[PDB]
UniProtKB/Swiss-Prot annotation, chain A:
Biological role: Receptor tyrosine kinase which binds promiscuously transmembrane ephrin-B family ligands residing on adjacent cells, leading to contact-dependent bidirectional signaling into neighboring cells. The signaling pathway downstream of the receptor is referred to as forward signaling while the signaling pathway downstream of the ephrin ligand is referred to as reverse signaling.
Disulphide bonds in the chain: C53-C176, C89-C99
Subcellular location: Cell membrane
Protein name (record): Ephrin type-B receptor 4
Species of provenance: Homo sapiens (Human)
Swiss-Prot record, chain B:
Subcellular location: Cell membrane; Cell junction, Adherens junction
Biological role: Cell surface transmembrane ligand for Eph receptors, a family of receptor tyrosine kinases which are crucial for migration, repulsion and adhesion during neuronal, vascular and epithelial development. Binds promiscuously Eph receptors residing on adjacent cells, leading to contact-dependent bidirectional signaling into neighboring cells. The signaling pathway downstream of the receptor is referred to as forward signaling while the signaling pathway downstream of the ephrin ligand is referred to as reverse signaling. Binds to receptor tyrosine kinase including EPHA4, EPHA3 and EPHB4.
Location of the Ephrin RBD domain: 1-132
Residue spans, topological domain Extracellular: 1-133
Tissue specificity field: Lung and kidney.
Designated name of the protein: Ephrin-B2
Disulfide bridge partners, by residue number: C35-C69, C61-C121
């Protein structure tokens, strides 16, 4: 009945507990790229968010977003909890053939923070595929007027990790999604 | 187009008698509203809860919040992107050739931080009006 498991969690990165710009790296740097701005979440507190919604405009294009360099500290396996909203494609006006209700996640380790805006190759290898992430819940909106929806929560797993640090990237291929927050941590 | 940050403290003289602050941001624009830190050259932090309100709720000075400025040791910020559609369920969404407003009914002190009526807004003209497009 009263058996206990204590397992302490150490945060690698938490966007919710930041009150300044996140300044993450995007590629290619074109109108339609992911974009940083403030918003509210289901807790109703103002946080740093990332949005992409280039659903008819995209022609075979990948919008990548990549975090800053994250010290692994002592983590071998990292957890990455994402909170997001994803729009239903057949409910968006001007949504094309390109429209996805999913997105993909990757990581890259390196011994130092030596990633740039154009290096390394923005493509799987040297990037390591974590998962393609689909939405259990879709949001429907009418511009200026009204919205229905629920926030998606997904925790992905990643590793084993070896090097001093890593970066986490998001690849969009046609979704209309807000990344409300990302929490990377490990359990000691 | 990143417009000039707006510092939300009573030393800000851009909040003019009666009128308050008036901006004209275009769609695509971004604007930081900053509640500033009490640093090593400033005595007397100013406690505000800052809100986006409708014309009638701005006219005059009631609520029913984009910044919770109750943190002296930290620069607290909201950045608005003036866009017509957000994929955030709670995202801010704005019309070409329409006006939006931002007020605070807090009276600068901890006690009144949560004052649902008064301000700032109706005492010191502490508000913005954004004539978008």
């Amino acid at each position: 009945a009263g058996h206990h498991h204590h397992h302490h969690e150490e945060t690698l990165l938490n966007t919710k507990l930041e009150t300044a710009d996140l300044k993450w790296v995007t590629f290619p740097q074109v109108d339609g790229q992911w974009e940083e701005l403030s918003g509210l979440d289901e807790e109703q507190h103002s946080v740093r968010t990332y949005e992409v919604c280039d659903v008819q405009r995209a022609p075979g294009q990948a919008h990548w977003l990549r975090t800053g360099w994250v010290p692994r500290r002592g983590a071998v396996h990292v957890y990455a909890t994402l909170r997001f909203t994803m729009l239903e494609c057949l409910s968006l006006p001007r949504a094309g053939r390109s429209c996805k209700e999913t997105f993909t996640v990757f990581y890259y380790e390196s011994d130092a923070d030596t990633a740039t805006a154009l290096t390394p190759a923005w493509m799987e290898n040297p990037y390591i595929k974590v998962d393609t992430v689909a939405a259990e819940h879709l949001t429907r909106k009418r511009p200026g007027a009204e919205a229905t929806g629920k926030v998606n929560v997904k925790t992905l797993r990643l590793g084993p990790l070896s090097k001093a640090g890593f970066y986490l990237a998001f690849q969009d291929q046609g979704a209309c999604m807000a990344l409300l927050s990302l929490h990377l941590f490990y359990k000691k | 187009i990143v417009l000039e940050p707006i510092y939300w403290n009573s030393s800000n003289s851009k909040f003019l008698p009666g009128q308050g602050l008036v901006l004209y941001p275009q769609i695509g624009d971004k604007l930081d509203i900053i509640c500033p830190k009490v640093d090593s050259k400033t005595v007397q932090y100013e406690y505000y809860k800052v809100y986006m309100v409708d014309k009638d709720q701005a006219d005059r000075c009631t609520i029913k919040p984009l910044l919770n400025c109750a943190r002296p040791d930290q620069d607290v910020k909201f950045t608005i992107k003036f866009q017509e559609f957000s994929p955030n369920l709670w995202g801010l969404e704005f019309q070409k050739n329409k006006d939006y407003y931002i007020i605070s009914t807090s009276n600068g002190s901890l006690e009144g931080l949560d004052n649902q009526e008064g301000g700032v807004c109706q005492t010191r003209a502490m508000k913005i009006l954004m004539k978008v497009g």
